[PDB]
Amino acid sequence: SSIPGPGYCMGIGPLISHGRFLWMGIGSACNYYNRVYGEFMRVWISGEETLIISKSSSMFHIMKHNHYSSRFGSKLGLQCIGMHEKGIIFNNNPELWKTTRPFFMKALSGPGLVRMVTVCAESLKTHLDRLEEVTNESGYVDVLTLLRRVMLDTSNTLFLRIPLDESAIVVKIQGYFDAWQALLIKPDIFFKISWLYKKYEKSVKDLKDAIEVLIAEKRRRISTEEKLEECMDFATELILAEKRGDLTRENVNQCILEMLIAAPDTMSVSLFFMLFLIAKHPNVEEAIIKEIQTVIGERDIKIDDIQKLKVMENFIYESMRYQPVVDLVMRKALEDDVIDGYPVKKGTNIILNIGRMHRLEFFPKPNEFTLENFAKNVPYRYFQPFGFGPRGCAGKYIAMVMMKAILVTLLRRFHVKTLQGQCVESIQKIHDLSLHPDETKNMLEMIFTPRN
Numbered sequence: 465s466s467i468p469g470p471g472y473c474m475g476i477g478p479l480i481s482h483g484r485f486l487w488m489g490i491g492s493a494c495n496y497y498n499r500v501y502g503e504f505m506r507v508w509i510s511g512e513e514t515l516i517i518s519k520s521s522s523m524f525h526i527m528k529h530n531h532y533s534s535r536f537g538s539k540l541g542l543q544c545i546g547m548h549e550k551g552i553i554f555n556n557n558p559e560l561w562k563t564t565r566p567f568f569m570k571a572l573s574g575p576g577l578v579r580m581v582t583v584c585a586e587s588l589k590t591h592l593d594r595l596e597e598v599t600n601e602s603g604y605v606d607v608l609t610l611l612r613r614v615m616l617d618t619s620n621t622l623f624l625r626i627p628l629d630e631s632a633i634v635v636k637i638q639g640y641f642d643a644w645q646a647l648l649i650k651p652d653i654f655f656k657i658s659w660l661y662k663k664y665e666k667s668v669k670d671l672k673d674a675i676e677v678l679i680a681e682k683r684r685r686i687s688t689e690e691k692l693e694e695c696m697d698f699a700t701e702l703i704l705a706e707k708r709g710d711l712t713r714e715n716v717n718q719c720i721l722e723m724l725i726a727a728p729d730t731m732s733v734s735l736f737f738m739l740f741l742i743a744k745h746p747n748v749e750e751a752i753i754k755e756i757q758t759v760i761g762e763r764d765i766k767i768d769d770i771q772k773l774k775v776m777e778n779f780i781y782e783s784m785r786y787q788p789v790v791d792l793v794m795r796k797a798l799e800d801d802v803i804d805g806y807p808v809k810k811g812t813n814i815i816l817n818i819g820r821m822h823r824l825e826f827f828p829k830p831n832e833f834t835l836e837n838f839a840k841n842v843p844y845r846y847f848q849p850f851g852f853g854p855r856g857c858a859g860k861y862i863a864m865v866m867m868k869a870i871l872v873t874l875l876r877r878f879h880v881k882t883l884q885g886q887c888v889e890s891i892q893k894i895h896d897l898s899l900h901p902d903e904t905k906n907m908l909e910m911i912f913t914p915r916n
């Protein structure tokens with residue numbers, strides 16, 4: 465099988481397609497190109513041939529096998545944000561990625577995942593008592609900012625635990641994400657004309673310098689520390705690995721950065737969307753509340769409770785299916801292969817359009833939000849919200865814990881209303897690297913009225 469997609473008009477196809485990605489945003493471009501051409505098609509980002517693929521089979525092949533455990537993107541852009549051959553998220557050096565990932569994987573499972581269930585709860589509680597910090601005169605809560613701050617507090621107290629300016633760092637993290645998003649697929653040309661990216665360069669510096677402060681203190685505390693065996697955590701594990709000779713200070717520093725931003729970037733937007741679904745789906749809200757009564761009562765949330773919360777689990781999955789935040793995934797082929805029908809050379813970029821795939825394949829009612837879609841056990845090869853295999857989401861397990869943890873603690877205490885008719889469908893979203901609300905609009909606030 466030869467490959468679908470636009471014509472290579474002797475060097476115009478590549479320029480229009482890259483330009484389309486820049487103009488529309490990565491995610492909407494992927495959808496455009498899938499809807500026009502096949503569910504398996506070719507495009508160019510910069511020069512290199514880049515496949516955009518929504519076919520469940522192809523997705524599964526790619527994530528399963530070890531010769532796709534790379535991503536891609538502008539080397540100059542990645543260098544700019546400090547992700548070029550450094551952390552793990554966009555660390556495309558196979559050997560260096562291989563050696564770094566285990567640190568993340570240890571921290572996001574076993575005992576740390578058990579700790580997380582209560583660290584999440586206490587953080588949100590603590591923030592819901594300080595609801596003045598986020599609420600209007602008119603009673604409107606800035607849910608996004610609330611969520612970001614608890615995601616950051618949570619992440620800190622589990623992986624690092626140094627005191628910090630919660631509010632300031634949340635704003636800096638947003639700046640870093642925006643920068644990352646901007647520069648990820650910008651052509652080299654862009655980086656020559658340098659009053660066009662100095663803007664972003666400063667966002668990165670601001671976050672990177674704020675974290676250098678924290679990791680500096682963390683270093684001091686480790687050197688003085690007496691019973692070092694007792695109080696292990698992600699930051700420490702890394703720092704100790706450097707102190708052997710396994711890791712580089714620069715790399716450590718990026719991994720710490722990357723762990724802190726991860727949840728503020730993604731969890732908060734997912735829970736936001738989930739809250740807007742709860743608002744406009746009262747049928748489901750009851751079921752969830754009934755389940756909480758049955759299972760938890762007015763006891764504190766505990767690790768053993770989370771498996772029992774079957775309805776909420778399905779709610780989360782359906783929210784992530786229907787309204788994804790991470791609707792697409794970037795890989796690269798490290799060896800040649802045949803993939804479904806088509807041949808794929810090494811160095812070929814890949815974009816798995818998992819958000820489109822969740823509407824085209826397995827589910828009874830793909831285009832409407834219903835828990836009937838998760839009434840019958842879903843095979844993991846028809847629904848990958850986190851990905852799987854050697855480079856799947858490192859937080860995939862702990863994330864589900866955290867989402868159940870915060871929804872329970874919030875919905876226990878507050879009914880959630882949404883201003884006007886506003887719903888997830890009527891929210892105006894940007895659809896570039898991730899899929900998230902356009903924050904330059906308004907009517908993104910919510911209202912929290914008590915229970916009992």
Ligand code: HEM
Nearest residue numbers: 552553726727734790849850851852855856857858859863
């Ligand atoms: C709703 C929540 C989340 C979703 C939907 C999500 C989804 C994803 C997806 C699709 C990937 C790409 C995996 C692949 O290429 O197959 C990914 C990567 C990643 N996620 Fe998440 N994620 C979430 C939360 C988190 C959290 C809370 C953390 C950390 C605390 C995290 C850390 C990562 C990391 C480190 C990677 C990169 C793995 C690598 O490239 O080696 N994620 N995530």
Ligand SMILES: C[C@]12CCC(=O)C=C1CC[C@@H]1[C@@H]2CC[C@]2(C)C(=O)CC[C@@H]12
Nearest residue numbers: 553725726729730790792793794897898
């Ligand atoms: C989940 C994630 C990591 C943690 C974080 O801080 C923010 C994001 C959002 C973008 C995700 C990324 C992981 C890698 C993804 C899936 C891609 O290959 C394209 C989009 C990108």
